[PDB]
Amino acid sequence: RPLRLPDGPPCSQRSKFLLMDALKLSIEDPSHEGEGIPLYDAIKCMRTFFGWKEPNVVKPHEKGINPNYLLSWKQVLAELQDIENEEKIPRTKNMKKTSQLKWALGEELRSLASWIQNEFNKACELTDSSWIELDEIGEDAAPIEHIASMRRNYFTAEVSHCRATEYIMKGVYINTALLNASCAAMDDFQLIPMISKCRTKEGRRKTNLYGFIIKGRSHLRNDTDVVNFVSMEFSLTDPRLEPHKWEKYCVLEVGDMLLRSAIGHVSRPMFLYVRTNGTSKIKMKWGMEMRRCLLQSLQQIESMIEAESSVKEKDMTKEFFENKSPKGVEEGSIGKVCRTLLAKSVFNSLYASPQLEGFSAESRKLLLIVQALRDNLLGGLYEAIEECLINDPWVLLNASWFNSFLTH
Amino acid sequence: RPLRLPDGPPCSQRSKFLLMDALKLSIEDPSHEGEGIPLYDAIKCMRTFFGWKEPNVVKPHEKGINPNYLLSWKQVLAELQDIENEEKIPRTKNMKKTSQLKWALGEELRSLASWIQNEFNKACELTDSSWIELDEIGEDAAPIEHIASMRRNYFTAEVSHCRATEYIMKGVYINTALLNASCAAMDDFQLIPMISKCRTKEGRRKTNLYGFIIKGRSHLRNDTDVVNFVSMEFSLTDPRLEPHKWEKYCVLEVGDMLLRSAIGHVSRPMFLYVRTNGTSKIKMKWGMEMRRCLLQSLQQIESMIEAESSVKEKDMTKEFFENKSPKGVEEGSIGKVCRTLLAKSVFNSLYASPQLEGFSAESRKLLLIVQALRDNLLGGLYEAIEECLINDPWVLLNASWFNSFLTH
């Protein structure tokens, strides 16, 4: 009996930042005065681009004040130009408390849509760049033993370039910046660049700018207290292709970018995805810990090597990772297994919800019952599972996956 | 005005062999007596697998004699067992001219379905293994100049592991084997293994067996003369998931395979996709030349570097491949551009048709007219294009792509 997924309008994006749709302005081997200070790096990235034009709304937010989102972007650009006019670049920039920002800062069943499976597939892919160091994974006090070290190196080599690892590092950077600003600049509408760093295939350092957030007032006395923010994220994705995805956003067209492509140089509109959002102290602390997805994925891999090693009375680390009893890998390669596990862990973090906790607990129970029936040959459990299937894209995708598992 | 795609039942697979659905039985650093002789290698690969079971039809061919396809597979397995009983393995194996083989060997609008876009996406992916040597590309008589060499090395590094390159090498091997057998064994129902070879990420030689074909009589006096064959190809793909894809096939369940996976070892049914098919001498000669897709893709890349070099009065090879004027790559990376170009070239070969030649000629004309109208601001051209849109999955996908180009 397959799970009944809800009927309704398609589900929409609810991540704290863009995933597959993100666009970076980047600088390579940066060495300007103040290299490493987020605002300085942001300005350097912004300075690489000369394609801006008069911005306009291309996908209105159905429940927001569209003119205020437009004003907010124009204010970022003007306040950055104000800095260029000053003698020195200040370490942080606090935005004028304009009417548009005061508004923006706050001072139902849905059906599964194809975009979330597509996000997940993109999260499993390899990128050109590496996102973590060779010794990134682990927190051990002492030096790791030989077999542990071997496993970490093999795993790290499969995931250091994975898109999901970019999302981890993006997530760590932005949550670190917003949590720090929430403490250090409680009354300020601080401009917070969305930054990541990577190493190119050629070995060069690269600093990336995805966009900006502006925070609101943030007197976060308890873990559950919320800081509001407005995010402004670059993209080449035309929001008119899948408008249901972008329910929570006002989308601007803000520039044009020249790109290399299969047909030679082409010019494409550059968009800016704008939304109001919020996060709590506890959520930011978890965001800061997203590197744990790597440890937890490695541990899942290590558990399987341990099982095989136990059987063959021999360490099976090399045989597992080199794919040397099994005649293949269902996902296609060991590397794809590593990345798929990682991507699931990262999406569990990015799309954390109570719907997800319930679905996860309840579905595991049903799995175990159905396997016991399958190997050897109710409602209430089903209602517990299906009550979690409301509108969350990640939970719905996972329910769709569960149903495939049942058909087979 | 978008192209009108045909209405009808979903389009079906028409490639000469399986693409994304293929499964290999493989052997590593092979060194048995007669290593390199196709039949010997096939037997070695077959010997790696102990999961066979009594075969049965799981997806019947609606217009074929299903019992004969089943008999044909059982006959392959028995004739291979006959060899194991003999003192020596013969160099080639000619099949008994049984009633099932004599039958098998011959002795309407469709709508676009999602599977062909999915095939194309899979063709663009990287694999764990390399499929070509460092000096594979090019036929030059003399040693290549420095700039040429640099470009070939950068390009080769982006495509040597590409799935599309596997399809090239698979295609070259099988067309070479069938063309050779058609000449050397004209009256025999020769068993022809479907083989490829690669090098693992660790540097080990690996020989792969995809399945078998059996040819019919082949007195190919002219280029257009046809040799019939029956193909028998391994797969983990359950044909009941997308039966419309498998219209031309009888699909058997023939074994079970133990696999590593994200959830530990799992057992999955192994299927055998069986169909009758045919090819001509001219088509096999083209199949033998599939390495030209690599040269032609490189040439497309080289043309773009030449254009940039002409502009900047400087060779732009490094700057192009290292992605150092353009601010990005529309497909995401230079590597993805290389693989996408390659995949399009490979699919043009794999899915060659008159529908494709007409669509290609006519659509290019319409592109040029629409761009001229776009930059500076009929039916008959449209009928020429749309008359090519009948049932071919590759042409239909390309028409769908053309329509996206129009919307934008």
Swiss-Prot record, chains A, B:
EC number(s) for this protein?
3.1.-.-
Q: What post-translational events are described? A: Phosphorylated on serines and threonines by host kinases, including human casein kinase II.
The record describes how the cofactor is bound as: Binds 2 manganese ions per subunit.
Entry superkingdom: Viruses
Q: What is its main location?
A: host cell
Q: Which residues form a coiled coil?
A: none
> Which BP terms does GO give this entry?
cap snatching; DNA-templated transcription; negative regulation of viral genome replication; negative regulation of viral transcription; negative stranded viral RNA replication; protein import into nucleus; symbiont-mediated suppression of host gene expression; symbiont-mediated suppression of host mRNA transcription via inhibition of RNA polymerase II activity
User: Which terms in the Gene Ontology molecular function aspect does this entry carry?
Assistant: endonuclease activity; metal ion binding; RNA binding; RNA polymerase activity
Q: Any idea which UniProt keywords this protein has? A: Cap snatching, Endonuclease, Eukaryotic host gene expression shutoff by virus, Eukaryotic host transcription shutoff by virus, Host cytoplasm, Host gene expression shutoff by virus, Host nucleus, Host-virus interaction, Hydrolase, Inhibition of host RNA polymerase II by virus, Manganese, Metal-binding, Nuclease, Phosphoprotein
Query: Where is it found, in Gene Ontology cellular component terms?
Result: host cell cytoplasm; host cell nucleus
Specify the enzyme's EC class, one word: hydrolase
Localization annotation: Host cytoplasm; Host nucleus
The protein's required cofactor(s) are namely:
Mn(2+)
Its family remark reads: Belongs to the influenza viruses PA family.
Protein role: Plays an essential role in viral RNA transcription and replication by forming the heterotrimeric polymerase complex together with PB1 and PB2 subunits. The complex transcribes viral mRNAs by using a unique mechanism called cap-snatching. It consists in the hijacking and cleavage of host capped pre-mRNAs. These short capped RNAs are then used as primers for viral mRNAs. The PB2 subunit is responsible for the binding of the 5' cap of cellular pre-mRNAs which are subsequently cleaved after 10-13 nucleotides by the PA subunit that carries the endonuclease activity.
> How is this protein organized at the quaternary level?
Influenza RNA polymerase is composed of three subunits: PB1, PB2 and PA. Interacts (via C-terminus) with PB1 (via N-terminus).
Protein name, UniProt field: Polymerase acidic protein
Q: Which residues of the full protein are shown?
A: 266 to 713 of 716
